[PDB]
Amino acid sequence: RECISIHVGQAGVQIGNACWELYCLEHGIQPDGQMPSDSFNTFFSETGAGKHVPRAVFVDLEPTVIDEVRTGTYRQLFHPEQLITGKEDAANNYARGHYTIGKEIIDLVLDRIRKLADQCTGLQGFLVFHSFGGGTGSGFTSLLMERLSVDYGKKSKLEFSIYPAPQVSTAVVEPYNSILTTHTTLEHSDCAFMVDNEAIYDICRRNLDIERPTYTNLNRLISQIVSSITASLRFDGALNVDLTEFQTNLVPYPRIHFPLATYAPVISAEKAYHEQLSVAEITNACFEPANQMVKCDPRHGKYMACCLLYRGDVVPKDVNAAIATIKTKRSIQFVDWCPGFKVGINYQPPTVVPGGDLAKVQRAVCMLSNTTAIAEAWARLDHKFDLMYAKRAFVHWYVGEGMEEGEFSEAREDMAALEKDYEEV
Amino acid sequence: DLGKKLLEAARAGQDDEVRILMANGADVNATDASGLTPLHLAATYGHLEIVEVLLKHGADVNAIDIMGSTPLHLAALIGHLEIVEVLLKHGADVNAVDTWGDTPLHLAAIMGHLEIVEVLLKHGADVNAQDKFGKTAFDISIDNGNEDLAEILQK
Amino acid sequence: REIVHIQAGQCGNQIGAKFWEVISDEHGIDPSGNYVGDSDLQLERISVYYNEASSHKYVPRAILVDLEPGTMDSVRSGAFGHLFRPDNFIFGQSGAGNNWAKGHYTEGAELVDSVLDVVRKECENCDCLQGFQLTHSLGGGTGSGMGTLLISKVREEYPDRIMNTFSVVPSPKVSDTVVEPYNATLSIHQLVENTDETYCIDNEALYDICFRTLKLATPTYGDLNHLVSATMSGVTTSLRFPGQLNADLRKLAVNMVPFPRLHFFMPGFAPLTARGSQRALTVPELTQQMFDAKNMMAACDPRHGRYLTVATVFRGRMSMKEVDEQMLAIQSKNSSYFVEWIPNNVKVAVCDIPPRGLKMSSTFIGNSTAIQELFKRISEQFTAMFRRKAFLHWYTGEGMDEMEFTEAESNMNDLVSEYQQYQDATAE
Ligand SMILES: C=C1NC(=O)[C@H](C)N(O)C(=O)[C@H]([C@@H](O)C(N)=O)N(C)C(=O)[C@H](C)OC(=O)[C@@H]2C[C@H](C)CN2C1=O
Ligand SMILES: Nc1nc2c(ncn2[C@@H]2O[C@H](COP(=O)(O)OP(=O)(O)OP(=O)(O)O)[C@@H](O)[C@H]2O)c(=O)[nH]1
């Protein structure tokens, strides 16, 4: 029951580099695909020679980032035909990624995806990694998601998306690109996990004691969260066994499909002898706003679903007790129309990546919550959008690249309705 | 008509043809269709000897064209310092005002002819004279951030 | 990837030559085309500006244009004069006489097709052409009139590529003639319509810096060009070395140009130095100075207007934490000068490689509404001349009509009014 991962633009590719680095280590696969010693078969094909190959595609409209994959440590891991690059990027312009430049390569990308899908006996769907802020990550993702819905109508599609942060940004128009891609992808995505670059940046600073975090620092932390979320798909999973179950468990209504991820513990590798944290302690830390992947205050919101994904030395009764204690807290309010926490346990401890910044721990947890408080993050983007769009600042760049001006207000109205959806629930 | 030929000769800087034309009765104060005289044209295009010759032979140093421009306005605009000096020596009105309200000082200040500005000031140019938007030459130098000009205008 | 550089007329070839000297030294290319450099960062993006010829030779992707031959002879006399492709010298014999009409319509038109052939040849050789960089003055005849003719023709043939200019604005403080405001106004009209990004290099500012700040009693063109070349190196750093921000011409434009006509940038840099001069500035000093009116290469005071967008680049080994702290501090302490309706409109890059002779430098690129002061100064000089019809025969005698003058001036005053509109706009 295969899953195909698609990595779009710089952020998607570099996050993909860290995700597959980690996956390989979790499954005992070497950078050349060989394995010394199956559940991982959902994410890796096997050739006739014992070589295990990610079911993964990397796409970018310029070559420099994927060229590093093509020549680096993993130059023999991936299908070389699934590393796809154009020559000229989207210039931080959604319209270039979606309408003009992106259309030069979309058919090639879909034909290479089809090659992977034809290798599958029971394809479940796609995991799509991308930024909001760049032109490829926003516009080409939207185009790809539209095309995949037509070509693979019954297949699930999950996103891992980078929500923009001014302090780590490369374009003024990142709010435009974020709203444009969210508008066109909303109908085509079943579940999307956003990561706020400022939130992860501050976790690296505060918990890993790294004064100036790099993208590699951020991306290895993101990969731990991604791996927790997809562990059920790659191992004997009792919770979230297939992609369909993410919507079942996390998305009560198709549009409100943005769960908040929280991860604990995050401990610097320089503290190799830290006191081991208990199930209760790591579970409590999932409700502290500073461990969240997106900046928002879930105490200002309501929960519609909550999944707790444990990894390591975790006894179920200890989970049930930890949950009993936090259920009592007044600051955790569920909507009336929902049951409730769902729990999965994977009994292997998180894997430590050589070169990583994380200390080995005996237990960890990733909480996925669908909370109305994430609308605060939508409101922050919408406000910056409104300030610029009222003056039509930069709009001519998009209109000159195949987009009609009315798509801006259509996208913003869709966001207004999305915010309303959150208020109503 | 010798008037038109003298206008063209003064514009073109043809000293010899200017003399021949005047020796044959050319109207030294002929005007073209806009009111410009041979002195206006010689002052505009830098022909110092023709300026001098015309002033010695009856040219009106303060003649105005239909826009109110005098020869000194044009010499101050284009930046011909010696001609400015000769015109002033022969009684040019240092504070003549054209239809835009500009004086010679305004035009020399706008065009950055700082040596001419100093000469015009020494000959009594009115630092309080306002153009039709209320600007003095000092206002122009402050509004355009020309510190060198502002310093000259304040001394 | 590739940029095609064109340099037109006397000013354009003089500052162009200096540009190629400065960046060749930064990338380790010697006057023969051989790489003698020390670091891998020097070659990583060398193809942006240099073709790689036979036997590890590097040749500027540069086209040299002038209606007067004497300039080409002097370029070839320079240190790097023989590194340029000889077939990329395109020169007439007549000159343009500081007459935009001759550059744009008469002798320039007769030479332009010969230039476009050489442009076409450089462009068809590119893996993925980014666009064009033109160096010229606006106050002459060849750089202004033929330069803008060249721009409109390249724009027609390459409408999908970025057109960037380094345009030297005339000043009475360094002037050959009073027709310079005519030539500049006619050109600005062209730049408003046909370029994507224009660096406003103002001879008024360059003179003021040399005379008053550097205490040079009689500045030479070499003195002015020392400031131009440092500016040109600084504003092209993000294009020539690896990096995340503004790494190509179109990403720069998308970050810097919120409205298509308002693409005229005020450059600035710190430290300001005279040729031969010699303590490295701190990050706080670098930041304060590159935003100071005294360090701008356009003669406009930023504090008289508002910043639409800003790019800054720090060069040298220095604390990234301090760079971010000082960049945040300038915005928060002066928040009223940055338009509130473009949030997060200042972006900063750091490049580890410092320019020649310094350990620490910083370059500012502002899209500020205060640049209207530059256009107003040219307009006032234009209007003073045009009201009296002075020298118009030189233009109409090449075929132009007075209406081209009126339309040029009207378009420039419209530009000014647009700047003031966004200067006064509010978020509400
Ligand atoms: C290299 C860094 N920073 C910079 O190069 C500049 C100086 N800087 O400090 C900025 O803030 C601006 C921009 O965000 C702004 N001006 O607002 N900029 C371009 C970045 O941050 C870029 C996107 O970050 C990175 O490439 C990496 C990513 C890592 C997570 C942190 N990083 C940095 O700190
Ligand atoms: N977390 C993380 N964010 C990244 C990384 N690389 C880029 N970003 C972020 O992604 C956004 C910029 O988009 P990019 O992915 O670089 O752009 P792109 O998809 O390549 O699109 P164009 O370059 O415009 O064609 C900003 O929010 C950056 O902070 C990365 O490796 N990790």
Ligand SMILES: Nc1nc2c(ncn2[C@@H]2O[C@H](COP(=O)(O)OP(=O)(O)O)[C@@H](O)[C@H]2O)c(=O)[nH]1
């Ligand atoms: N900064 C600078 N300005 C110059 C240089 N040469 C000429 N200029 C200016 O350019 C204008 C004259 O244009 P020029 O390039 O000489 O005319 P062209 O050869 O017909 O394009 C005036 O504003 C001069 O001050 C130079 O080397 N540096």
Ligand SMILES: [Mg+2]
């Ligand atoms: Mg990119």
